[PDB]
Design a protein around this ligand. Structure first.
Ligand code: CDL
Ligand code: CDL
Ligand code: PLX
Ligand code: PLX
Ligand code: PLX
Ligand code: PLX
Ligand code: PEE
Ligand code: PEE
Ligand code: PEE
Lengths: 459, 104, 69, 55, 53, 347, 56, 122, 140
């Protein structure tokens, strides 16, 4: 794992010692190179995970997440360098440094062998994200958003810290392999109930679970474009990865401790999808869509079947790509017209045709058109839920309809009709923006050909 | 002053197309802009996408699915060649298990 | 690809065996240390948790101006 | 009704309101040593009774 | 917290005055000299936890 | 104040603390506290004004009351055993009195009222001294008599200290009172783990002293004592405000920063002694300190407040005096978590 | 010719060098976990007439 | 609350007993020593930045002294830390050995004879 | 003293509800007296009788809360034939919160106190059942 990690660290002084006009070029080139090297973790043994050393290991659950992180960094650099043009050299280097530190923390968190190291890195991701949001955020509301993002997260994660140190005192280890091989059932007692809650609530608030989701519209809407990209594509998946890891010590209690979280996630799926139908802000709509998708992932993890875990992995990856693409698409128009309101600019297909094609493809993967991997994940989760109880189809069926509705609503409102007469500063699409969209989209389509790579450990 | 402060006026954003009609949207400097375009396109579409997809497509069978298929073929041949059951409801040998002796 | 970039399964297999042995030994050592600390703090017979008493070398064993000390 | 009002009211707004009230109660002292010292006497009496009588 | 400079240097800055059985002027004894001598010799070197029981 | 006199007084303060730390006799420990207070009162009034006079007066009254109580506890202990050695107290009542006296000397809740007022009333150098060096002596005494102390009283005062530090810090715009409430909460953390592991107390104290020295030196370097006055430092010294931002996050206890290590070590030790509940409260309450640190970081480094025209003249002048240990203090305040197993050298 | 272009493009060696150094450190880390090399009940083998270790 | 302060035959202020010399010293490329040197380098850079000097170039003798001081102190810190952990393990093993009636060896069962409870996931 | 806590807990759960209500009322009154003492010390009441009135108000509120809680919880436990159940303590605490809300004459305070007091009391019952320690002894 050292081969991936050291170069990422190297990226730091490479950008601090670069000429003022070459920072973006250098960072993008070597980020792409790092992504290529990482691509080699997808070779998986089968029966067990690849254990590089005592400290790091890679899984089939882990490999897809790492490749997505490393691939997301150059895209964030492409998306950032436009609105950061007026910035001083030192502040541009500081912004790139924040992004690099975030990538470094993320890679380590996914591959840490034991929970305490996972916890420390999973929490260290908070600092660069908060700095990005509050320092480079466009609006006044960013300060409030930063506080919401911090406090919601820490209120969940500190009980997890207490629970983890208690578990290592009683078991003797927090190493994930030892944790798995020496697993013993959790009795049904008040102590075990609160241990379960303390082990679960941090990852629940990271997802986010419905009702503990209020930080996400704030933080995802008030952040700069790269902040939003990394918040939706990767940082939401920390909760899913951590839950998939931690639920091995929680059996057989999960059988009934999962009921309220399943109820919240299914009904709130319906709720956030309906909310997307009456939204005046375009980033707000994409944020709530992310919430709806992660509710599906929460259900999949709580019901604890091989098909549900496979579907959850596929949906996490597909959501990460699609949501980042949608945020970038919204940001291009925002850059044009300097407002987030969805009905301000209309009929953009008449003015920007290729960007309208990108819009259509992103909207089609958001509603999970077959045979995209979005539908693969959603279908696997829906089947597992059907096995869990046949009545889930009603909720699942309803959600599919509302998602199609708001996806095509967004597409029709922004691209179709007639253009607003007054706005006359809509310039042709830049090569940078088109290439950013293609680099989001091509990987998703390519993934359909080889579905097993994003499927996970259960496969 | 009936003012609150000495502040710069909010400037209009500059169109990269005005000084560079073919400007690729990467940078104000046309040379740096062209080379940013070139490095992005080469290292993203040529190196990572094509060569990486090829590498992933030709990854060796470490997941052992071909091996598993051949093993199942051996087992099925041997088991219905001998009249034995294709599969046994017991995964482990009942002679290696020592149940608790009395059940009431 | 397998010849240029990877190794055989035996390397990862036996590295995993080594890792597992190290971790399991550390776990049992941690539990044993907790038990040893509990006993040493409760009994005070161990090297640990030794609370100072008065040095007997301070006492003066000389005739004390009266016969009964 | 749910996102903008009640989910706001229950978790984050309640926390802000309570901590704001407690901060105002704790920090608004008049700076008179007479009042501070009087409390010290109260504290000393309590400890030597509900803590010193208990062993 | 307690840096034992006296024990490291062998100084006796204040140990002459800690107990009643320790070298009084003119060999004047404490009222409870024998009892304290006995309690000190009984508990010496066994540590605080064992000495109390 | 003559420089030679100031040096003599600082040396007398430090020598009183060292007397408390090297003594085996309760009378010499009391003398150390007396000498420390005697030399410390003039250092508070070095820059004379009514506020400094009031602060020194409140300080003297509080500390002299604590001293009388401490002496009374020593005398009761002697009455019930002819002992002067500081080991484990023999009498329970003497131990209660001693614990309350040392809590008053430290400023633990409910005896916390004096710390914000005295800190606000003095200069930043005297505040640095008051909040770093003035903690060593009572903490060392408490570490020596730790087995004897009753857990219920100690933990009550510690939990109160954490709560009251957070709540009181939420309301401040003056930086010295923010630092004082921060100190109160930190003291609560140090004393909560004392009946279990004095090494964790020592580790917490060392990290807190490092972070507090860094913060006070950064506040002296940018000669600000209010929030709005610190809001200008970006337009003269941006590096200073960035370093202060990172030091503020370390104080908050957020990982991967050093400030998180003491909290992490303390919670773990407590769980070993079957105490899940106290720690859950302590961490969830330290969230308040993190909130007002974040507010200060918002006003000082993450956004840019308006400035004044006369700042242009300051742009032309370098700082006359430079702090030698400020750079080291920042690095130790932020980047020391990977060195955590080095705590074994503290026991 | 190459002096100042080296002075302005030398930053392009940092990340490849870090990659090489990381591969080296991964090999060194492997060298610490050889307690069961050719010792597992599943893969234990007889060494070839000239080979020294079953994996390095 | 004070586990190792009262240990027998302990010199008050040594920082490095003579018994510590029976232990292997830390290598000079010990990654913890390298991290201490990196801490010294960061201290040098922050020093340059505070005094408004060029950050990577200004005082090379000063930065060298920073790094050297950090590495020098860290070596002895690592020696003392490793020695204290060696003491802990020595004492723990001796105590387990001298109190066998508190750490009994009970016969362990194979999983074929332990009846474990099964919980179906459905 | 915690002798008051023992006079509360020496009575079995669903038995002698009048005695348990008396004990809880005593605990509440002690709490209210301490609260009013600190309140009078840190914020002077401008006259002797106004201090007496503030003391009476605080102490009566606290003793009423204790009485309602103990009465409701003991009665619910004995009617439901369910001792060792945190639901009785939740019901008692929510009734005490409603008492506090009716006392301050505030619907928001009433509901919030119902909820938080009930949850706290249920947690205290769970801790009594499972053996949770607030001020844990130094075991190791
Ligand atoms: C080894 C360690 C042990 C150490 C401790 C040992 C101590 C022993 C020594 C005691 C012997 C006396 C020695 C002399 C002391 C010097 C006194 C002095 O100088 O006064 C200055 C001080 C100020 O002087 P000043 O400025 O010139 O006068 C201005 C006016 O006074 C004020 O101007 P104003 O009119 O504008 O202000 C309004 C008025 C308003 O005053 C008030 O509001 C007070 C009215 C409250 C009435 C209480 C309700 C009655 C029922 C409660 C009974 C409890 C059990 C009931 C059970 C259920 C009932 C059914 O005054 C105030 O606000 C000031 C507050 C003073 C109140 C008394 C302070 C005690 C603590 C605060 C508690 C408050 C009561 C809550 C209940 C707590 C539990 C009883 O004078 C006073 O405030 C009061 C007069 C002092 C005389 C009495 C003092 C004796 C009490 C000492 C401690 C008691 C024993 C402790 C524990 C015992 C167990 C072991
Ligand atoms: C995560 C996903 C989403 C979840 C999050 C979203 C949902 C969570 C939160 C959403 C909202 C829940 C918040 C609760 C309400 C907060 C009240 C408040 O803010 O007070 C401040 C606010 C400030 O007032 P103020 O400044 O002090 O004075 C000026 C007033 O405005 C002037 O007021 P006024 O003079 O006009 O009249 C006030 C007076 C009279 O009010 C009126 O004038 C109109 C009458 C309203 C009462 C309605 C009763 C008739 C309908 C009830 C139907 C049965 C209930 C449902 C059962 C269905 C059966 C299948 O109020 C009363 O005295 C009511 C007496 C008792 C009746 C209500 C208490 C019963 C509790 C329900 C127990 C259910 C147990 C579970 C059942 C199991 C089966 C599922 O007070 C109000 O104005 C509100 C008054 C009405 C409150 C009662 C309505 C509550 C409805 C149920 C609440 C229980 C849900 C929570 C469960 C957890 C419990 C442990
Ligand atoms: C034949 C044509 C059709 C098929 C094409 C096949 C496609 C394959 C090519 C794709 C490249 C694969 C991506 C690289 C990932 C591998 C990284 C790592 O795993 O490789 C290391 C090996 O290093 C390799 O050299 C990888 C380096 C690859 C770097 C790619 C950079 C390409 C950039 C292109 C720039 C071209 C010029 C630019 C002009 C401006 C392994 O370390 P090692 O310690 O051995 O492990 C022990 C294994 N042993 C025992 C077998 C030795
Ligand atoms: C808005 C989004 C927030 C996030 C959502 C958080 C969800 C947390 C909910 C936790 C799920 C259930 C918790 C415990 C499982 C059962 C709870 C209990 O009611 O069940 C009965 C328990 O009996 C009674 O109900 C006792 C509990 C009643 C007291 C709790 C107060 C509940 C009021 C609701 C308050 C809201 C809590 C969330 C705050 C936001 C079962 O009977 P019993 O077999 O005997 O007990 C089983 C435990 N044993 C085996 C140890 C004995
Ligand atoms: C605009 C103009 C449009 C008109 C022009 C259209 C031109 C034609 C387009 C259509 C082409 C159809 C191609 C169909 C696929 C054929 C090849 C396919 O089968 O390869 C697949 C394999 O595809 C690859 O696995 C795709 C891998 C994914 C590529 C990732 C790119 C690098 C990562 C980029 C970042 C990713 C971020 C997210 C990471 C999770 C499956 O191969 P498989 O059936 O087994 O092969 C059997 C024999 N083998 C195994 C020996 C080869
Ligand atoms: C934020 C990081 C904290 C920084 C702390 C300051 C570091 C610089 C201080 C200067 C170092 C010299 C101190 C000691 C030199 C010789 C003195 C030696 O003899 O002291 C011995 C003791 O050695 C010292 O205690 C060790 C000091 C090492 C402190 C560093 C550990 C920090 C914990 C993890 C953070 C990593 C820090 C990285 C370093 C920069 C005496 O033993 P003893 O008299 O019987 O114990 C007294 C206390 N008792 C009785 C209560 C037990
Ligand atoms: C028992 C004690 C437990 C301690 C728990 C502490 C929770 C930590 C959160 C601290 C929030 C503090 C908020 C506060 O004090 O003031 C509210 C604040 C005051 O504004 P100021 O910036 O101070 O002044 C501006 C005008 N001059 O008003 C606001 O708008 C607050 C906005 C941000 C609030 C963020 C709250 C997020 C909470 C998420 C849920 C979890 C919180 C923690 C408790 C979890 C539930 C058990
Ligand atoms: C846990 C114990 C549960 C305690 C129940 C009471 C908690 C109430 C908090 C919910 C909010 C209700 C509310 O309205 O708060 C107001 C209420 C004051 O009344 P007002 O409404 O402001 O007056 C109206 C006219 N100006 O707020 C308060 O004063 C109480 C705040 C402190 C809550 C208790 C916190 C104690 C923490 C320490 C525990 C150890
Ligand atoms: C952003 C919002 C997120 C909010 C998350 C809050 C919920 C987190 C989950 C519960 C937190 C505390 C759990 C404690 C950590 C686990 C430690 C443990 O398992 O030890 C238990 C101890 O269990 C407890 O003591 C826990 C009691 C609860 C104390 C704190 C109460 C805080 C509120 C509890 C309910 C809230 C939890 C769910 C809320 C979710 C958020 C809405 C058993 O150990 P022993 O003491 O040895 O018992 C057996 C030997 N006799």
């Amino acid at each position: 794992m050292l081969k991936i990690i050291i170069p990422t660290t190297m990226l730091l002084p490479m950008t601090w010692m670069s000429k003022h006009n070459m920072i973006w070029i250098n960072a993008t080139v070597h980020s792409l190179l790092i992504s290529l090297i990482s691509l080699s973790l997808l070779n998986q043994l089968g029966e067990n995970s690849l254990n590089f050393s005592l400290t790091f290991f890679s899984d089939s659950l882990s490999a897809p997440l790492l490749v997505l992180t490393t691939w997301l960094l150059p895209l964030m650099l492409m998306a950032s360098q436009s609105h950061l043009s007026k910035e001083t050299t030192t502040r541009k280097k500081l912004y790139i440094t924040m992004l690099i530190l975030l990538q470094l923390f993320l890679i380590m968190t996914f591959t840490a062998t034991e929970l305490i190291l996972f916890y420390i890195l999973f929490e260290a991701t908070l600092v660069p994200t908060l700095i990005i949001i509050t320092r480079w955020g466009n609006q006044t509301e960013r300060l409030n958003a930063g506080l919401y993002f911090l406090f919601y997260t820490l209120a969940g994660s500190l009980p997890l810290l207490v629970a983890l140190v208690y578990i290592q005192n009683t078991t003797g280890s927090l190493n994930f392999l030892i944790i798995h091989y020496w697993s013993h059932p959790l009795s049904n007692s008040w102590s075990n109930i609160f241990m379960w809650l303390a082990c679960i609530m941090a990852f629940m608030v990271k997802m986010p679970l419905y009702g503990l989701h209020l930080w996400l519209p704030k933080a995802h809407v008030e952040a700069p474009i790269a902040g939003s990209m990394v918040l939706a594509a990767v940082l939401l998946k920390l909760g899913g990865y951590g839950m998939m890891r931690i639920t091995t010590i929680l059996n057989p209690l999960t059988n009934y401790m999962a009921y309220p979280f399943l109820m919240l996630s299914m009904w709130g799926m319906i709720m956030t999808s309906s909310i997307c139908l009456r939204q005046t802000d375009l980033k707000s709509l994409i944020a709530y869509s992310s919430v709806s998708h992660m509710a599906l992932v929460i259900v999949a993890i709580m019901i604890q079947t091989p098909w549900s875990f496979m579907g959850a992995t596929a949906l996490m990856i597909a959501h990460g790509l699609t949501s980042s693409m949608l945020f970038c698409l919204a940001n291009t128009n925002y850059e044009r017209v300097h407002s987030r309101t969805m009905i301000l600019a209309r009929g953009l297909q008449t003015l920007l045709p290729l960007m309208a094609t990108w819009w259509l493809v992103a909207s089609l993967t958001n509603l999970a058109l077959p045979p995209s991997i979005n539908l693969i994940g959603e279908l696997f989760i829906i089947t597992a839920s059907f096995s869990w109880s046949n009545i889930t189809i009603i909720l699942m069926g309803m959600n599919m309809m509302i998602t199609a509705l708001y996806s095509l609503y967004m597409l029709i409102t922004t691209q179709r009709g007639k253009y607003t007469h007054h706005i006359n500063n809509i310039k042709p699409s830049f090569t940078r923006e088109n290439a950013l969209m293609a680099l989001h989209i091509l990987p998703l389509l390519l993934l359909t050909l080889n579905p097993k790579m994003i499927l996970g450990p259960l496969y | 002053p009936t003012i609150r402060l000495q502040e710069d006026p909010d400037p209009e954003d500059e169109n990269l197309y005005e000084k560079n009609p073919d400007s690729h949207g990467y940078d104000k400097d046309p040379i740096v802009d062209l080379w940013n375009m070139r490095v992005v396109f080469f290292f993203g579409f040529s190196i990572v996408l094509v060569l990486g997809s090829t590498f992933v497509a030709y990854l060796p069978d470490y997941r052992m699915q071909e091996w598993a298929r051949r093993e199942a073929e051996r087992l099925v041949k041997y088991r219905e060649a001998n009249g034995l059951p294709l599969m046994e409801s017991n995964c482990f040998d009942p002679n290696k298990i020592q149940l608790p002796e009395d059940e009431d | 690809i397998a010849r240029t970039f990877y190794d055989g399964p035996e390397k990862n297999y036996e590295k995993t065996m080594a890792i597992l042995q190290i971790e399991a030994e550390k776990a049992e050592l941690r539990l044993k240390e907790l038990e040893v600390r509990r006993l040493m703090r409760a009994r005070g017979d161990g090297p640990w948790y030794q609370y100072p008493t008065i040095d007997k070398a301070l006492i003066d064993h000389s005739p004390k101006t009266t016969p009964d000390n | 009704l749910l996102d903008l009002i009640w989910l706001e009211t229950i978790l984050p707004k309640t926390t802000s309101f309570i901590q704001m009230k407690m901060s105002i109660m704790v920090s608004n002292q008049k700076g008179l040593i007479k009042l501070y010292f009087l409390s010290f006497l109260i504290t000393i009496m309590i400890s030597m009774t509900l803590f010193n009588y208990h062993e | 917290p307690f840096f034992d400079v006296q024990k490291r240097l062998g100084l006796d800055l204040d140990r002459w005055m800690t107990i009643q059985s320790a070298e009084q002027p003119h060999k004047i004894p404490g009222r409870c000299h024998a009892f304290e001598k006995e309690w000190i010799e009984c508990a010496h070197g066994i540590g605080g936890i064992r000495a109390e029981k | 104040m003559n420089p030679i006199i100031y040096t003599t007084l600082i040396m007398t303060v430090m020598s009183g603390t060292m007397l408390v730390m090297i003594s085996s006799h309760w009378l010499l420990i009391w003398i150390g506290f007396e000498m420390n207070l005697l030399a410390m009162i003039p250092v508070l009034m070095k820059n004379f004004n009514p506020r400094a006079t009031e602060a020194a007066t409140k300080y003297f009254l509080t500390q002299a009351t604590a001293s009388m109580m401490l002496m009374m506890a020593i005398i009761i202990n002697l009455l019930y055993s002819g002992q002067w050695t500081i080991t484990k107290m023999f009498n329970p009542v003497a131990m209660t009195m001693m614990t309350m006296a040392l809590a008053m000397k430290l400023g633990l809740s409910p005896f916390h009222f004096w710390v914000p007022e005295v800190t606000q009333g003095i200069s930043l150098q005297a505040g640095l001294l008051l909040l770093t060096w003035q903690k060593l002596a009572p903490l060392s005494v408490l570490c020596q008599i730790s087995q004897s102390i009753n857990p219920n009283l100690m933990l009550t005062m510690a939990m109160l200290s954490i709560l009251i530090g957070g709540w009181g810090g939420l309301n401040q715009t003056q930086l010295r009172k923010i630092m004082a409430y921060s100190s109160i909460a930190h003291m609560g953390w140090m004393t909560a783990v004392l009946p279990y592991n004095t090494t964790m107390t020592i580790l917490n104290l060392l990290i807190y002293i490092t972070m507090t020295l860094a913060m006070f030196m950064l506040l002296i370097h940018s000669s600000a004592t209010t929030t709005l006055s610190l809001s200008h430092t970006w337009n003269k010294m941006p590096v200073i405000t960035s370093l202060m931002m990172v030091t503020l996050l370390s104080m908050g206890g957020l990982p991967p920063l050093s400030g998180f290590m003491p909290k992490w070590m303390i919670i773990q030790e407590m769980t070993k002694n079957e105490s899940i509940i106290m720690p859950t409260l302590m961490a969830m309450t330290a969230l308040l300190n993190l909130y007002f640190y974040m507010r200060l970081a918002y006003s000082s480094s993450l956004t840019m407040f308006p400035s004044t025209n006369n700042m242009k003249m300051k742009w032309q002048f370098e700082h006359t005096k430079q702090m030698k240990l400020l750079p080291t203090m920042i690095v130790l305040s932020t980047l020391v978590l990977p060195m955590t197993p080095a705590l074994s050298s503290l026991n | 010719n190459v002096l100042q272009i080296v002075r302005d493009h030398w930053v392009h060696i940092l990340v490849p060098v870090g990659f090489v150094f990381g591969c080296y450190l991964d090999r060194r880390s492997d060298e610490k976990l050889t307690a069961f090399r050719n010792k597992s009940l599943l893969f234990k083998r007889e060494l070839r007439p000239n080979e020294e270790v079953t994996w390095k | 609350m004070t586990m190792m302060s009262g240990r027998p035959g302990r010199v008050p202020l040594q920082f490095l007993p003579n018994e510590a010399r029976s232990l292997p010293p830390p290598k000079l490329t010990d990654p913890r020593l390298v991290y201490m040197g990196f801490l010294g380098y960061c201290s040098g850079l922050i020093d340059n930045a505070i005094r408004r000097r060029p950050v990577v170039s200004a005082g090379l003798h000063r930065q060298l002294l920073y790094v050297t001081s950090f590495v020098f102190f860290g070596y002895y810190l690592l020696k003392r830390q490793d020695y204290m952990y060696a003491l802990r393990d020595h004492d723990m093993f001796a105590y387990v050995k001298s109190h066998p009636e508190d750490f009994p060896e009970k016969d362990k069962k194979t999983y074929g004879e332990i009846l474990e409870e099964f919980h179906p996931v459905r | 003293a915690k002798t008051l806590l023992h006079k509360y807990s020496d009575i079995p759960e669903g038995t002698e509800c009048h005695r348990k209500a008396y004990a809880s009322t005593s605990i509440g009154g002690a709490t209210g007296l301490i609260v009013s003492a600190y309140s009078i010390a840190l914020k002077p009441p401008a006259s002797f009788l106004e201090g007496v009135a503030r003391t009476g108000r605080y102490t009566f509120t606290s003793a009423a809360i204790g009485a309602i809680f103990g009465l409701t919880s003991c009665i619910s436990a004995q009617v439901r034939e369910k001792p060792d159940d945190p639901l009785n303590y939740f019901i008692g605490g929510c009734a005490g919160g409603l008492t506090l809300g009716a006392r301050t004459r505030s619907y928001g305070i009433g509901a919030a106190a119902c909820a938080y007091m009930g949850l706290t009391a249920a947690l205290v019952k769970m801790g009594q059942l499972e053996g949770w320690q607030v001020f844990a002894e130094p075991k190791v």
